Design a protein around this ligand. Structure first.
Ligand SMILES: [Co+3]
Ligand SMILES: [K+]
Ligand SMILES: [Mg+2]
Ligand SMILES: [Mg+2]
Ligand SMILES: [Mg+2]
Ligand SMILES: [Mg+2]
Ligand SMILES: [Mg+2]
Ligand SMILES: [Mg+2]
Ligand SMILES: [Mg+2]
Ligand SMILES: [Mg+2]
Ligand SMILES: [Mg+2]
Ligand SMILES: [Mg+2]
Length: 74
RNA sequence: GCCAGGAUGUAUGCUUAGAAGCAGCAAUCAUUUAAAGAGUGCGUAAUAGCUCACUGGU
């Protein structure tokens, strides 16, 4: 019955990306780049907080958070 | 018109004493949907709160 809340998708991303802060211009300045297998884990870990059906959709959300903060996936 | 929803990653990222849809900057993705803007106004120190777009009902 004790709800353990997971860290925001954003911070989880910075962590995995090895960066102090996200980009101020997400489209122009890309601060870092990570991998799909990493978005994989973030989506898997954060899953309880999400409202997604599958992990593909979960990752779709995570990528959206990363896309909007200058992070890139490969 | 009235009734009811108007959600979720998320207080997006940045910046900023604070900046949580709504000072300002760059963006404006994604999920679950019948539908629901990275938010139309009002509101708060910042929250909260009221509200619209949008959806269903009558
Ligand atoms: Co939509
Ligand atoms: K703000
Ligand atoms: Mg109403
Ligand atoms: Mg209401
Ligand atoms: Mg939101
Ligand atoms: Mg922030
Ligand atoms: Mg400055
Ligand atoms: Mg803002
Ligand atoms: Mg509100
Ligand atoms: Mg304001
Ligand atoms: Mg602007
Ligand atoms: Mg809404």
């Amino acid at each position: 019955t004790f709800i353990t809340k997971t860290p925001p998708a954003a911070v989880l991303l910075k962590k995995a990306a090895g960066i102090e802060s996200g980009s101020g211009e997400p489209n122009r300045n890309k601060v870092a780049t990570i991998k799909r297998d990493k978005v994989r884990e973030i989506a898997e870990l954060k899953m309880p907080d999400l409202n997604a059906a599958s992990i593909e959709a979960a990752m779709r959300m995570i990528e959206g958070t990363a896309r909007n903060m200058g992070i890139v996936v490969e």
